[PDB]
Every structure is written in C-alpha cells, then in structure tokens.
C-alpha cells in the first residue's frame, strides 16, 4: 500500500472518482466542474496563421536568429530583461497566449514548491525521504535524504531512455497515463515509485524522473494538498500569471510533477523573474533568498559525471532540480526534452524562455544548436 | 470503414496521434500545445469557500429561492433579462467563471451549428443522412432525413438508460472515452454509430444521443472541420464569450457532441441571448431568423409521445435539438441530465441558465422541482 493521499475532492474515498464512477454521486458534483481531469478534452475557442517575430532589440546582433529558431523547432521564445519583454517569437499556429508542455522544466517548478516548504520549516532536506513517506521503505528511496532526491544523487535501476519501449521511463509513463497501460503495470504513480530499486549507493548524479515525483509525494504528505493544488498555492498563484497553468494527472489525480506542466512562455518567464528577484514574486515570497543563492551556486561538481552535460559545461553541476552550467556567466536552466528551457542569465538580469518540439527528445545535435542560441542571446544582452 | 474525418492537425494521418504516439514527430509539435486533448489534465490556478447569492431582483417574489436551488443541487444559476444579468447564484466551491458540464444542453449547441450550415446552404435538412455520410449506409441512419435526426424522429434500437450498465448509452460512453473500454467495443464514436439498427420506422419522437453525434459527423463532412473547430467557428467565437468552452474528445479527436461541452453559466446565457435576438450574436449572425422561429414554434405535437415530458407539458414537442414546452409562455429549453437547462422565456426577453448536479440523471422528482423553479422565476420576471 502507498498510504494516505489527498482526496480528489473533500470527502472523496481513496482513488475516487474513476473513469467509471465520475457520473455517480457524490463524485459528480466535483466531476461536472472538472471534467478535463477525467476525460481528454479540447478547447472551443472564443476567438475567431503566420509566425510572429518581434526580436528587434537583439535582431541587430543576431540577424539570422529567426532562422536559427526555426531550425530548432521553436514554438515559443521570449526574452525578459528585468521586468521588460524585449524579444518574442511564436511559430505559425501558436498564439502568444497558447500554453506549451514544459516536460522536465516542470521539475524546476516542483523543486521550487519543495523550497517553499523548506522555508516554512515543514521539510528538512537533511531528513530521509521515509520521514515523510514511510511507505517508500523497502525501495531505493529508503535511506537517501530529501536533498539527495532534490540533487538527483541516488543510484537507481531506472533506464531514463525516452525512445526505448522497454525502459522504466515508459513504464513510468504507462503508470501515470501518458501511454496506454499494459497488463501488470502499476495502478498509479505512487505504486510505480515503490517498485524502484538500486544498489544503495548515493552521491553521484543520476538524472531520474522518478525523483521529482517522490518530491511531489513528499509535498502532498507534508501539506495534505493535492500536488496540483500545492503547485498553485506555493508557486503559480503568487506569480500574477496571465493564465492558469495545467498539469496532467494520473488516475488518482496525482499531478505528473516530473514533466506534465503546460503554461504560456510569458508566464513561465515569471518563474525566472522570481528566481532573479531573490525568491520574491508579486504575490509574496515564494522561496528564501538562501534557496535561490544555493541554486545559483550549483551542486557538487564531482557528483556531475554526465559526459554529455560536462562536454559543453565542464564546470557544470545540478542542484534542487536545476541544471547549473558553471560557465563564466553563471547560467542556470530548467531543461525539458525536445527543447524546453527556462534559462537564467543573472549577469543581465534576464530570463530566456524557449519552448520547442524537436523531432528527437535528446541528442547532442539539438543541444549544441539550442545552447548556442541561448548563449548567443545572453551575450547579446550584455552592455556594449 | 467510416470514411474521411478531419485530421487532428494539418497533415495528420488517420487516427493520429494516439496516446502512444503523441510524443513522436510529427505529432508532437501539435500535441505539446494541446496535451489536454490526449491526457487528463488539471488546472493550476493563477488565483490564490461559501455560496454567492445575488438573487435580489426576484428575491422579493421568491423568498425561499436560494433554498430551492440548494435542494436541486444547483451549482450555477443565472438570469439574463435582455442584456442585463439580474440574478446569479453559485454554490460554495464553484466560482462565477468556473466551467460546468452541459450534458445534453450540448445537443442544442450542435443543432445551432447545423442551423448555421443550413443558412449557408451547405446542409439541406430534407436530404438523407447518407447524402453527407455515405458510410452510414446499412445502419438505422440509412433512409432518414437530416431533419428527422434533428427532430429525434427515428426509431432506433438504443436503450437511452443512463444507469443501466447494459444500455447502448454506456457502450456509446465507452466508445467515446467517457467510460473504460471493454474488449470488442467500437474503436471510436464513428464506428459505434455505424453499428446502430432500427425497425425502419420514423415520425415518432425517440430521444437518442446518437442522433446528435450523427449531426456532428455531418457537420465535419460538410465543412472539413473537426467538430471542435466547427463549434467554435459557427457558434462560440461569435458570442463574445468570456472564456473558451471545452468539449471532451474521443480517441480520434471527435468532440462528444451530444453531451460533452463545458462552459460558464454567463457564457451559456449568450447562446440564449442569440436565440432571443433572432439568431444574431455580437460577432455576427449565427443562424437565420427562420431557424429561430421554427425552434420557438415547436415540433409536431403528435410525434411527442414521451409521457414523461407531456405529463408536465401536454402540448409539448421537440425540434432541432431543443425541447419545446408548448406552455402558455412558449418556453423552450436545452436540457441535460442531472439538472442542466438553457431555458428561454421570450415573453420577458429572458434567458435562465441552471447548471446542477442532481444525484440521479433523470427522475420525475427532480424534473418536477427543477421545472417548478424555472417557471416560477420566469413568472417573477413578468411586468406587474
Ligand atoms: N516521462 C516523460 C518524459 C519526462 C521528461 C524528461 C525530460 O524532460 N528530461 C530532460 C533531460 C535534460 C537533459 C539535458 C542535458 O543532458 O544536457
Ligand atoms: N452519454 C452520456 C450522457 C448523455 C447526456 C444525456 C442527456 O443529458 N439527456 C437529457 C435528457 C432530457 C430529458 C428531459 C425530459 O424528459 O423532460
């Protein structure tokens, strides 16, 4: 068993409603107001064709920028310098206020929610995961600290290969509803997480999407809130965002914390703005000054043995669900597959959002092109 | 085979993407911007507990109105007199701008889209269904006219019982994704519709949710648009609505035309306002003056043999996806199970929206209470 989880609505039994019960009372009062949480749904537009390019301020220094964005399958691109939007691009068919899947940029949002609860003293990163989720006893998460989950420094038998049909990634997807279930698959994300094992070693970076969903589970046990609601209460509702974000949910209503958030480019930039403002957003403080400082400082370099990342960023590292380049600019970024970045450039007090749809999830080729763009744009923002 | 359907996105193969392919190219460019269409998803609120009652203008004549609304499981209630909102109620936990499932009030919206295409001369109600959907040859829809579909005057072997697990209603739900699929179930709504049979007789009213989805299929074949888009282009985008509506979609992306729309109470009222304005909305004419006049006029009374409806409304009838009371006020209404009404009161130039969640889909008890409220409120709007 996976223990207590936040009810889908006040008074709801465990796991209720399901696809087969949502039309029945008492579930239907909630379900009729939230049907998209149960059944795939399309927007019927209240508004009655070509790319929008407003690169302007940086166009002079990067003349071929629009072409470079096209070549990296860019859907939305936005540069926020200070509080000002100084450059924007949206592909044909994607409106400025359309939402876009963040993939693992979602992880950086989850880490922020954890940080908020650390600031409140409700989570101690030094404590073992099992202090908050006892039901993870007997799994690979039995022993490691919350900080080791945050920093992805737990050795886990989990093949994070996004194209291999046999990988734990796909089983993770099937358990959560991103792919069609197979017979024998775990019923939900919580159950899947408890099946994970490892050799017990810690301290070396291993990127594993399961870690973030464990963080979200901790958030739920500490707050009593559905992760969906915690993500709003501790982060999204303080941003003065233009639109709600969305997050996919599994059959229990658990948000897909490691990859399932969608939002507008402009609103995602507000998360970066909060980070460069020492953790404060328009609606109040989100995380502590110290938390932000530790993110910008980076993780242990020696833990970072991912040759892929360090080939580009030799002094790079990872901490608290952020990638840290360790480059001369101190760039830090949320990253999601197929070309999602929430990229911070503290030197120029700027945030770069790039949301894309590369044909491939993760190759050296696409990252070389993408990082070239983000670095060039960052440098174009320097005083001259 | 069910023939040509509108692609989910430009250039998409038939049936693409599926839950298992949406992360792959070329699907992922579309899917990353529309993930809610593929995977159940929750809103993450951008906004940081008790019922809102603003009945006022009619409160004096109906002192116990709020209690009566509570007793009928009212979630949202709104009265539009002319262009003015003169009364509103929202239960605790439901915000004024929250969306609510319409159930079969959705049918009246679909009929409106059909009406728009009739006004354009792209649909002739006198023509057989098979003029537009040849693939329905061999089914119960082989022979009947489009108007007979619109008026629900086709005898069909289809048990429209919402609680019986053996009914065609539930098979319809399973085919479309409202309930969990069983082995052997049709793959999508189109396939399900082609399995329907009847004795061949027409002319008598038989309420059948399949009829509306056949209408939506016709809309798609005539326009080349996904029903989701047609519902926007021909109706929703002309309303000057506050919010998008939503509609659930099946695995091909086909909107659940007969019951799956959700919208705000205020925006639903704009549909009623359009009907009482002779078919014109802020964004342009939606349907012809003649179409609206025929809706208000009613269908054939002799076709209406539903003892349930006629017990309350002896001179009642049904036409073009609207229920016509035939009462002394000429009231007409969209109706959906569990207490949804888009109720028109032409005498007072008023629209009443009531969106509810009765524990039961359809009983004499709930309809007696609900109709009592709608009639009392209508009469309270009369000059005195
Ligand atoms: N389970 C569905 C996919 C989950 C999202 C995975 C994701 O977005 N991963 C990002 C990996 C970034 C790697 C960056 C690098 O190595 O340089
Ligand atoms: N397939 C899922 C449910 C489809 C919605 C059915 C629905 O809303 N039906 C309305 C029936 C109204 C009957 C009114 C009366 O008889 O007075």
Swiss-Prot record, chains A, B:
Pathway(s) annotated for this protein in UniProt: Xenobiotic degradation; nylon-6 oligomer degradation
Keywords: Hydrolase, Nylon degradation, Plasmid
EC number annotated for this UniProt entry: 3.5.1.46
Keyword DNA damage: no
Effect caused by changing residue 258 to N: Enhances activity
Recorded catalytic activity of this chain's protein: [N-(6-aminohexanoyl)](n) + H2O = [N-(6-aminohexanoyl)](n-1) + 6-aminohexanoate; N-(6-aminohexanoyl)-6-aminohexanoate + H2O = 2 6-aminohexanoate
GO molecular function, one term: 6-aminohexanoate-dimer hydrolase activity
Active site: 104
A Gene Ontology biological process term: nylon catabolic process
More info: The EII enzyme is 100 times more active toward the substrate than the EII' enzyme.
Function: Involved in nylon oligomer degradation.
Protein name: 6-aminohexanoate-dimer hydrolase
Taxonomic lineage of the native organism: Bacteria, Bacillati, Actinomycetota, Actinomycetes, Micrococcales
Gene: nylB'
């Amino acid at each position: 068993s996976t223990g207590q989880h936040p009810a889908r609505y006040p008074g709801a039994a465990a796991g209720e409603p399901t696809l087969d019960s949502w039309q029945e009372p008492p579930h239907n009062r909630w379900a009729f107001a939230h049907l998209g949480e149960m059944v795939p749904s399309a927007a019927v537009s209240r508004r009655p064709g070509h790319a929008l390019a407003r690169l302007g301020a940086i166009a002079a220094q990067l003349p071929d920028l629009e072409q470079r964005l096209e070549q990296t399958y860019t859907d939305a691109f936005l540069v926020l310098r200070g509080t000002e939007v100084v450059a924007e691009y949206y592909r044909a068919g994607f409106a400025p206020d359309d939402r876009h899947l963040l993939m693992a940029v979602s992880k950086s949002l989850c880490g922020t929610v954890v940080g908020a609860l650390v600031d409140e003293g409700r989570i101690d990163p030094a404590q073992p995961v099992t202090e908050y989720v006892p039901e993870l006893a007997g799994s690979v998460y039995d022993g490691p600290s919350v900080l080791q989950v945050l920093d992805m420094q737990i050795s886990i038998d989990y093949n994070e290969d996004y194209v291999d049909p046999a990988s734990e990634v796909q089983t993770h997807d099937r358990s959560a509803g991103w792919r069609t279930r197979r017979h024998g698959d775990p019923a939900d994300t919580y159950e899947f997480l408890t099946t994970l094992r490892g050799d017990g070693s810690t301290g070396e970076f291993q990127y594993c999407s399961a870690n973030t969903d464990v963080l979200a589970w901790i958030v739920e046990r500490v707050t009593g809130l559905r992760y969906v609601e915690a993500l709003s209460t501790y982060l999204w509702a303080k941003l003065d965002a233009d639109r709600d974000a969305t997050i996919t949910v599994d059959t229990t209503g658990f948000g897909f914390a490691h990859g399932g958030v969608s939002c507008t480019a402009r609103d995602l930039a507000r998360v970066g703005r909060m980070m460069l403002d020492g953790g404060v957003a328009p609606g109040g403080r989100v995380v502590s000054e110290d938390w932000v400082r530790r993110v910008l400082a980076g993780g242990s370099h020696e833990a970072m043995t991912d040759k892929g990342f360090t080939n580009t960023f030799p002094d790079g590292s990872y901490t608290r669900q952020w990638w840290c380049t360790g480059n001369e600019r101190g760039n830090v970024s949320g990253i999601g597959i197929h070309g999602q970045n929430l990229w911070l450039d503290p030197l120029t007090d700027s945030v770069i959002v790039k949301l894309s749809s590369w044909p491939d999830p993760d190759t050296e080729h696409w990252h070389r092109l993408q990082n070239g763009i983000l670095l060039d744009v960052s440098r174009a923002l320097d005083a001259v």
